Amino acid sequence: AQNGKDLLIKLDLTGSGQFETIAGLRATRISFNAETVDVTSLESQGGWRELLGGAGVRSASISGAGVFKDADTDERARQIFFDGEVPEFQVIIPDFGIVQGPFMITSIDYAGSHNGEASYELAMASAGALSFTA
Amino acid sequence: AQNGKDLLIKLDLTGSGQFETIAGLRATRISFNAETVDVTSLESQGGWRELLGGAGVRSASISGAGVFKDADTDERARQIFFDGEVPEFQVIIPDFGIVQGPFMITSIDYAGSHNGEASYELAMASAGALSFTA
Amino acid sequence: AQNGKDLLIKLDLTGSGQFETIAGLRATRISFNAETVDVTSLESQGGWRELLGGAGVRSASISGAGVFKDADTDERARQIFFDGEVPEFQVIIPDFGIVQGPFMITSIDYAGSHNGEASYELAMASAGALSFTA
Amino acid sequence: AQNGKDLLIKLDLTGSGQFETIAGLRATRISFNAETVDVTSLESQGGWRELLGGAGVRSASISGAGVFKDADTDERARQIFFDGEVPEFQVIIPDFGIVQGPFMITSIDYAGSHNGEASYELAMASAGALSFTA
Amino acid sequence: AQNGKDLLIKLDLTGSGQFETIAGLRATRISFNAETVDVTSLESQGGWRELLGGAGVRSASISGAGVFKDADTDERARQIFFDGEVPEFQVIIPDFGIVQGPFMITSIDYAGSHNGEASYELAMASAGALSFTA
Amino acid sequence: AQNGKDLLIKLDLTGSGQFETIAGLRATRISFNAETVDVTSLESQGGWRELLGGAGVRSASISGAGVFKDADTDERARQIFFDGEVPEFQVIIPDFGIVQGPFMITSIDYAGSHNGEASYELAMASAGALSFTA
Amino acid sequence: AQNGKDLLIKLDLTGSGQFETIAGLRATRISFNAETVDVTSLESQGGWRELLGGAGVRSASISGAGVFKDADTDERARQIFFDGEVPEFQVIIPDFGIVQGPFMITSIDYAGSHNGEASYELAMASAGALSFTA
Amino acid sequence: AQNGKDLLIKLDLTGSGQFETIAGLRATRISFNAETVDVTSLESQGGWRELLGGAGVRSASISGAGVFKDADTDERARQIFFDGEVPEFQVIIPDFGIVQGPFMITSIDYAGSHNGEASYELAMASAGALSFTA
Amino acid sequence: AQNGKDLLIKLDLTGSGQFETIAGLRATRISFNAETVDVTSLESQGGWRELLGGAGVRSASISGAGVFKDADTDERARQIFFDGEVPEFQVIIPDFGIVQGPFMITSIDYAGSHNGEASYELAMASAGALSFTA
Amino acid sequence: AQNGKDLLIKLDLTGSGQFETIAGLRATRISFNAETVDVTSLESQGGWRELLGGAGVRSASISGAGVFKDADTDERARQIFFDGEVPEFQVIIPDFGIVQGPFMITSIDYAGSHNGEASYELAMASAGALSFTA
Amino acid sequence: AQNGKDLLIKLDLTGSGQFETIAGLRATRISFNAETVDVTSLESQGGWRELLGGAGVRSASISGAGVFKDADTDERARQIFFDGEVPEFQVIIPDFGIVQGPFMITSIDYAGSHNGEASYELAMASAGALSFTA
Amino acid sequence: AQNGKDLLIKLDLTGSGQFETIAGLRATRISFNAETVDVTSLESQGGWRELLGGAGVRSASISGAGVFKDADTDERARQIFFDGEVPEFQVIIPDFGIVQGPFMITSIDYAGSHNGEASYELAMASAGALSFTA
């Protein structure tokens, strides 16, 4: 078993190796996807859908949500949306290890309520090759 | 940490620098978006979806909801829908700072109930360049 | 602050100036919309989505629901669906004032239950120019 | 005010004037619709969406649900689905009066549970001209 | 009135007349459908949507869900998905009578939980002519 | 009757016959599908939708969710997403028997919360012929 | 004034008119209920909650408790729970008269103590129309 | 000071002005309620919950209990539950004056014991506008 | 009349017919339940809630409490909670006869005090068909 | 120490500054509440629940009960329920000082018994900003 | 028979085998629970609720209360709440034997009065597998 | 053993280290809580509910009640509710030591009676990290 509060997603401050967790984030998710490229012949020994595997494009989608704690790492998340770039990110699956890919911050949104805290959600998409440091 | 009741979205009364909060607004949200322009080559070192970053169009969507308090700032929100223009707006992320862009008021709607208060929601979309005053 | 039970939507009995509230209506809503006509140049000082404002078509959508009280104003709502015309309607935002536009009654529906009352919903759409009498 | 249990929808037994309520039906609804045919000129005094009114096609949709009581009127609802015809139906809005149009029974469905009763839903669509007897 | 536990859906064991209920099934539904083929003339005495009735294709959709009881009738439901055929099925509306049509088993799915029972859902579609034995 | 905790889905460690359950998985589902290829003639003895049966392509979709227990079988699930291949999988319907087909791991996603455990969902799709060992 | 020991609740022995009191019952109660179907208009001359009256479903709940005296009428109460049916019951309000409705025996429970007598409680619910013979 | 035995609740015998006390009633209570419709702005000078007052629906609940004295006024309480109507009632707060509203009798229940008297409780709910005659 | 100390609830020692009372149990209760499946039509001759009777699921709940006497029958109650099974139980209503159903031991709890004895409560739920041997 | 009979809650007679105690009130209570808005980060130095403080909405609830003494201040409590308004109230904590806020009278109820006095309870809720005069 | 003061619940001092009773504890209770996973088929020979037994999750809940005696075993109960872990506990049912499972201390609370002693309650929940040493 | 009158809960006067007991408080309680985050695998060696321990959020709830003695420490408890902040508090478990955390005062309430003293209750909730000074 493994606790969820050790599944940290990290952002670059200087753009080179200085990885810090964003802010108070309450729910986090890295989501991988494949594209299921259908190769169904005339012969499929009963008509089973045969798949190809290597050919589909693959992606990783980050989804993070939490409370607005105005750390410097949170402002470095805000500004890389503005001069929209694809910096390097790092998700630590808590005892798998490090994901370490570049991601583009597609959607950032700051929400508040009269009776609640200021909360931000944060969604990112894969921008390049992913790795696995362990 | 930071309270949500200091995330104010402001509207122009005279159209030039006179920024006031709209009315009793109970939930507010500024939502940013990118367009994820896919550049996936023949070579992607395993088939990872490569993204471009700078090329996608970017947007900001305001979503505000609250109780109908018939302030002058609320009527100035109503009339700019009618002679539909793109005036300047200002969202204050509570200790980031000022957003300060022009927005078009796409959807305004006044709702009431027999056992409830009169409530308005308010949705706006980006009309131009956004800034960050801090 | 302002109560929701003073947000009355009114219908014409004679088709000329004789405006009455429909029936026992429990929830009412006038909903305005713009069309967000995108004008995004090659140059947008960072790629911000620029909007045009004046060009989009604009609309108003009425949504009313309530209990079936068989007033004469309710039958005048029923018959104008049948010989389908675009009579003049009037929404009173409770201390803004009068909306006063022509609307077509798109959807009317009479619903009942074995353990409930007879209820009608009522949805209308903009048929022409809107005003603001205040 | 008016009770919902007097909003009866009636079916023809002999196909000519012999109208009976279907079965134990617990929720009933007649739903009318118009088609909102858009006529938006170059000139619309501000860009308001102008509508035409008389041109859109109009419809009536019956939605009835209830418990399976195997009356003869319920079997006459079953068989007119099979040799699919458009017999005459009659909805009595409880103190408006009679609707009296022909409807096609589009969807009938008999559902049961291990811990529940046998229930049928019943959806019909307009097949011709509607009337209003009052 | 009529109990829902007498609405049995039956499957063929030998493919010829030997009809048995599947397994422990907790919710069952046979759902019929018509296609509402629109015939709206230039003249429709007010613009009412006129329908044709006999022309639309008609269908029957079975939906069954329940607990996985590994009867022989359940394995005969599994194997007819594999060598995908259209065997004869029988729904008994509890005091209407017998439906008796051929159906193709489109979707079968076996689901389990760590704290629950093993449950299967089962969805079928019409494969031919339907009858009514009563 | 049959317990749900004996519906195990198994993954290959060495790619050849060494089948182990993934991790702590809390909900599991194998979902089969057919394609309902419509063959509706001009003659269908009343207009019943006739189906063909053998012609539609057929598929199996695995859906597994559970807690992140970092077993070696869980890392072997992670890596086969990366060098995306179609290894052999095995679902044991608890007293039917073995499913034993090749599947591609389309979607894997590792999710955590500040107050919850680290959880993974896991969705797979059919990559070839399915069997039934019993 | 009127004594409570003349408020007898009676059960059918043969299912047809042969009504006998159950056993030694020490406390008895017939409880009627309405459903308070809310019809609150936009206008209610001050906002008073207006009710409809005729539309709500109505029920009768029997509650009987007493000592286990193993009469034949007590065993006829036990067996109608097992082959669960809705036989006819009769409550005699002592100088109103007879209630005479069908009731389903929802809850029967036989309780004993080491220092007490064997006691049964008995709760029933309305199964149909109620009457009043007086 | 004021005695409680002069707080009489009265029922209509003929339905028009003929008001009599029910029976031997030992405890009586008229209970009024408001709905506390929350209007809490973004600004509330410290975050105090601001309320609206006029908008909430208001109700009156009668609760009466006593001994079963089989007066004609008690039978007129019984029968108006059966053909469930909303007759006019009258509570006399002993030196305020008269309440005089219509009420629906939601719950009536006749209870007896082997060692006690026959007792009835009686609960009513507001059905319309309330007054105050004094 | 009948004593409560002859209302014995019995447990299986060998799992086959060897029924013994548990321990010193001071209060015992078998509680039966039905599910009151509501079938309320549009017509109910006044709006009486009509019930169905045969369709509701039925259950039996055992509740036993007493002093901890460490008999072998008490340890056989403890262990069947651990390897959680549904063995056969037997309640003897003292001159009705035998209940004889299978029950699952849902809740067992051993409680002690500094000034009291060691006491256990014991709650069971129906696991299958119930009988009545008499 | 301080006596409880000097904790007076006062009502406005003229609506402006004329504050009087209601009637014979036997138990009184002003109850304040906060909303505990949870801000629990990913990091909380051990997982302690961190709170925000300023963001939660705050309220004050009056609860008063006593004997019905028909003073003019008691009738001014009755009538402000009817034309439901939010007048100004004043609680004197006996040597703190004055509370002085506006409150809505949510629940008033007049109760009497055959052997008791006429008693009223009285519950109010916060309608706006609270103060502290001391 | 067996005394309650020999039902000791024991805590680990070193985390490995060194089990001591907590403090002066006046009332203690270990409470076991099952989850009653319902498997009710279409056929249940009369509609009896059939249960599954092996599938439900099972738990053990400790409830201990007593006087605050500041032993070292009491401080070892306090600190394992702070760095919240799941250490091993041991309940000795006095002549059954040893329970010996890991438990998480969910709720600890220290209470005192001006005229009473300092008392602590203590509630724990099952964290893993339970045993039975006897 | 240890007396309850040495379990003092202390409040800050200046907000920095100046800790005093509130007032005459008659009953006091600090209550800790964990969140029992369930991690129940497919395998749990018999189906025991396995828990995670470190992941659940943890809290501390103060409950204090007593007589209104208008000390300066009592007014400092009143005012920190008004400008609602999260000051530092200190509970002294009498020979454990000091708790020393920040708490928000959720509920304060001043109650009085005609024959009793003025009493206040006081409930607080955890606002941050807790400590243990001993």
Residue numbers in the entry:
A (entry chain B), B (entry chain B), C (entry chain B), D (entry chain B), E (entry chain B), F (entry chain B), ...: 3 to 136
Give sentences from the paper.
Gene transfer agents (GTAs) are DNA-containing phage-like particles produced by some species of bacteria and archaea.
The long loop of the tail tube protein mediates interactions between the tail tube proteins from successive discs and between the tail tube protein and distal tail protein. The structure of tail tube did not reveal any changes after DNA ejection, suggesting that the tail is not involved in signaling to trigger DNA ejection after attachment to a cell.
